[PDB]
Scaffold this active site. Structure first.
Site, PDB file in Angstrom:
ATOM      1  CG  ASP A  15      -0.404  -0.184   2.525  1.00  0.00           C
ATOM      2  OD1 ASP A  15       0.815   0.102   2.669  1.00  0.00           O
ATOM      3  OD2 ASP A  15      -1.128  -0.619   3.451  1.00  0.00           O
ATOM      4  CB  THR A  35      -1.421  -4.235   2.078  1.00  0.00           C
ATOM      5  OG1 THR A  35      -0.434  -3.214   2.303  1.00  0.00           O
ATOM      6  CG2 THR A  35      -2.183  -3.888   0.799  1.00  0.00           C
ATOM      7  CD  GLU A  37       3.527  -3.267   7.662  1.00  0.00           C
ATOM      8  OE1 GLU A  37       4.731  -3.109   7.375  1.00  0.00           O
ATOM      9  OE2 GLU A  37       2.629  -2.446   7.337  1.00  0.00           O
TER      10      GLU A  37
HETATM   11  C1  LIG Z   1      -3.885   5.537   5.213  1.00  0.00           C
HETATM   12  C2  LIG Z   1      -3.584   6.593   6.248  1.00  0.00           C
HETATM   13  C3  LIG Z   1      -2.693   6.305   7.238  1.00  0.00           C
HETATM   14  N1  LIG Z   1      -2.395   7.244   8.191  1.00  0.00           N
HETATM   15  C4  LIG Z   1      -1.496   6.950   9.323  1.00  0.00           C
HETATM   16  C5  LIG Z   1      -2.371   6.324  10.432  1.00  0.00           C
HETATM   17  C6  LIG Z   1      -1.411   5.309  11.100  1.00  0.00           C
HETATM   18  O1  LIG Z   1      -0.757   6.068  12.144  1.00  0.00           O
HETATM   19  P1  LIG Z   1       0.093   5.103  13.126  1.00  0.00           P
HETATM   20  O2  LIG Z   1       1.517   4.785  12.417  1.00  0.00           O
HETATM   21  O3  LIG Z   1       0.390   5.948  14.273  1.00  0.00           O
HETATM   22  O4  LIG Z   1      -0.557   3.714  13.481  1.00  0.00           O
HETATM   23  C7  LIG Z   1      -0.465   4.908   9.929  1.00  0.00           C
HETATM   24  C8  LIG Z   1      -0.711   3.557   9.236  1.00  0.00           C
HETATM   25  O5  LIG Z   1       0.120   3.558   8.072  1.00  0.00           O
HETATM   26  P2  LIG Z   1       0.643   2.078   7.648  1.00  0.00           P
HETATM   27  O6  LIG Z   1      -0.520   1.181   7.448  1.00  0.00           O
HETATM   28  O7  LIG Z   1       1.448   2.336   6.335  1.00  0.00           O
HETATM   29  O8  LIG Z   1       1.600   1.580   8.793  1.00  0.00           O
HETATM   30  O9  LIG Z   1      -0.519   5.955   8.959  1.00  0.00           O
HETATM   31  C9  LIG Z   1      -2.982   8.462   8.138  1.00  0.00           C
HETATM   32  O10 LIG Z   1      -2.755   9.279   9.023  1.00  0.00           O
HETATM   33  N2  LIG Z   1      -3.864   8.789   7.165  1.00  0.00           N
HETATM   34  C10 LIG Z   1      -4.201   7.894   6.226  1.00  0.00           C
HETATM   35  O11 LIG Z   1      -5.008   8.264   5.394  1.00  0.00           O
HETATM   36 CA   LIG Z   2      -0.110  -1.476   5.815  1.00  0.00          CA
END
Ligand SMILES: Cc1cn([C@H]2C[C@H](OP(=O)(O)O)[C@@H](COP(=O)(O)O)O2)c(=O)[nH]c1=O
Ligand SMILES: [Ca+2]
Length: 129
Positions: A15, A35, A37
Site C-alpha cells: 500500500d 495491506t 506487512e
Molecule cells: C492511510 C492513512 C494512514 N495514516 C497513518 C495512520 C497510522 O498512524 P500510526 O503509524 O500511528 O498507526 C499509519 C498507518 O500507516 P501504515 O498502514 O502504512 O503503517 O498511517 C494516516 O494518518 N492517514 C491515512 O489516510
Molecule cells: Ca499497511
C-alpha cells in the site's frame, strides 16, 4: 477529484509506492486501505500485486481527495491509478487489503471500496479465506 500525472520510481510494498510527482520524489500511501506487512500472511502477495500493477502500467496517475494530502509521516495520501485502474480498489477486490483508515474529508471512494471488499469476502479470497 482530478487525476494528475506521475511516474513510478519504485514499488515499496502493498500500500506504499514511490512516485515522482510534479518532478519531486515522494512516498505515497494508498487512501482507505490496509495491506498486511511483508512479514505477515498475504503480505508478500500484496507487495507483489501492487508492484506488478505499478510496474506494468504505461501510465500512473495520482488523485488526491478533498482533505489532507500528506500524512503525519510526510507520505502523500492518494488514490493511485495504473492505466485507468485504481490500485486501491484492485487490492481490496482481490482480498489483499481491507478497507481501513477512513477519515472524514478524505473518503470520496469509500462506498466503491466497501463494495469491492464485500465481493472479495463473499468469494472467500486471500485474506478472507
Ligand atoms: C492511510 C492513512 C494512514 N495514516 C497513518 C495512520 C497510522 O498512524 P500510526 O503509524 O500511528 O498507526 C499509519 C498507518 O500507516 P501504515 O498502514 O502504512 O503503517 O498511517 C494516516 O494518518 N492517514 C491515512 O489516510
Ligand atoms: Ca499497511
Amino acid at each position: 477529484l482530478h487525476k494528475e500525472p506521475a511516474t513510478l520510481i519504485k514499488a515499496i510494498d502493498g500500500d506504499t509506492v514511490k512516485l515522482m510527482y510534479k518532478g519531486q520524489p515522494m512516498t505515497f500511501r494508498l487512501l482507505l486501505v490496509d495491506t498486511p506487512e511483508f512479514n505477515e500472511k498475504y503480505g508478500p502477495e500484496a507487495s507483489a500485486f501492487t508492484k506488478k500493477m505499478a510496474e506494468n502500467a504505461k501510465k500512473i496517475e495520482v488523485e488526491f481527495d478533498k482533505g489532507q494530502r500528506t500524512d503525519k509521516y510526510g507520505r502523500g495520501l492518494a488514490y493511485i491509478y495504473a492505466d485507468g485502474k485504481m490500485v486501491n480498489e484492485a487490492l481490496v477486490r482481490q482480498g489483499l487489503a481491507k478497507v481501513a483508515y477512513v477519515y472524514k474529508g478524505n473518503n470520496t471512494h469509500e462506498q466503491l471500496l466497501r463494495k469491492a471488499e464485500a465481493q472479495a469476502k463473499k468469494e472467500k479470497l486471500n485474506i478472507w479465506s
